[PDB]
């Protein structure tokens with residue numbers, strides 16, 4: 240194996256720490272979120288991990304965006320972390336729950352005022368006429384919210400992905416990449432991890 | 444807009460060139476491929492772009508892997524290119540066609556012998572007992588194929604994604620990210636690109 244922990248959330252923590260300390264990785268928490276329609280049309284985009292633990296992986300967005308519409312209709316997702324300078328990939332699959340509105344509100348107000356105003360101004364993924372449109376509306380909302388709290392948009396909040404599958408991939412120069420996959424659940428190549436996790440090695 | 448071309452495949456080419464010339468990007472052709480089951484369970488993983496043009500985006504894999512099973516069942520995919528040092532993202536969505544077997548064979552034999560043997564040895568995403576298993580089988584196949592052509596596995600080949608949607612995202616320090624989305628297909632904020640493409644600007 241060559242693992243730090245047989246709890247894959249703690250293995251993730253170990254790798255995440257190493258990615259944060261790597262000077263050649265800009266945002267260690269950048270990840271690709273894949274969603275799809277119930278009818279099976281996939282979509283995917285980058286966003287930032289904003290909290291993780293036993294309960295899973297947290298991220299925030301406008302619920303009226305493509306990703307929010309798909310998660311609300313079809314609450315299953317996949318994440319990919321790719322840390323090229325360390326030749327490492329982490330894949331996560333699992334169901335998603337929307338975060339309580341109180342938790343989203345508290346998180347929203349912990350962010351810089353410019354980010355809060357950014358969320359108000361931008362109906363994420365709606366059509367706009369040009370660049371200047373955005374700059375102008377942002378400055379008008381800056382005026383509106385001088386010395387005042389910015390309210391969280393009704394359409395803004397978070398989700399938590401509860402992991403059911405987690406794969407750790409370490410690339411190798413000889414092409415025989417190390418892949419260790421954890422799944423929640425015995426064959427001779429299948430092994431018991433912590434809690435209800437099982438793990439096995441996969442061919443690259 | 445701030446674009447090089449209103450054909451989004453040529454816009455992609457322009458950005459791809461800039462990513463290749465960036466010394467802080469290791470593999471400019473690394474991309475995240477999102478697929479899903481017909482029933483709407485998404486999955487996603489990194490792989491390499493291996494050709495692109497008017498017909499679309501080409502990639503190669505074992506058809507018996509998760510991605511191959513999903514594409515064969517449900518031939519729709521999404522790609523994400525993320526070039527952190529340039530603060531750029533490209534998203535592509537479209538249908539997939541499997542490449543002709545003759546084209547796959549010719550491509551397979553153009554690769555280094557070690558890569559060809561790697562494809563034979565590794566039933567991608569099947570379970571294996573340990574690291575040494577892989578090293579040993581690789582060396583045995585090296586013996587078998589000394590001074591001899593390696594046959595392409597029946598289960599190995601490629602796919603081409605024909606783009607229907609392409610988004611170009613340029614991150615900005617002020618958070619008002621530039622997003623220009625091209626779709627194949629008139630509102631006042633929707634514009635004609637080349638061929639059957641339309642484009643518009645989206646809120647970040």
Ligand SMILES: Cc1cc2nc3c(=O)[nH]c(=O)nc-3n(C[C@H](O)[C@H](O)[C@H](O)COP(=O)(O)O)c2cc1C
Nearest residue numbers: 269284285286287299300301304305306307364532
């Ligand atoms: C590094 C990076 C991080 C991002 N983080 C987020 C985020 O944390 N939340 C978010 O809503 N969008 C984020 N985006 C923007 C998304 O790529 C996307 O433009 C947006 O969320 C709309 O996606 P959708 O239309 O597919 O739902 C990020 C983009 C980049 C490049």
Ligand SMILES: Cc1cc2nc3c(=O)[nH]c(=O)nc-3n(C[C@H](O)[C@H](O)[C@H](O)COP(=O)(O)O)c2cc1C
Nearest residue numbers: 328473488489490491503504505508509510511568
């Ligand atoms: C940078 C990078 C490039 C990769 N390129 C490929 C590839 O080109 N073809 C491929 O089959 N797997 C590639 N992989 C491995 C995939 O991440 C994955 O392990 C494998 O294809 C099996 O995926 P699946 O089980 O989801 O189908 C790559 C991994 C990394 C980190």
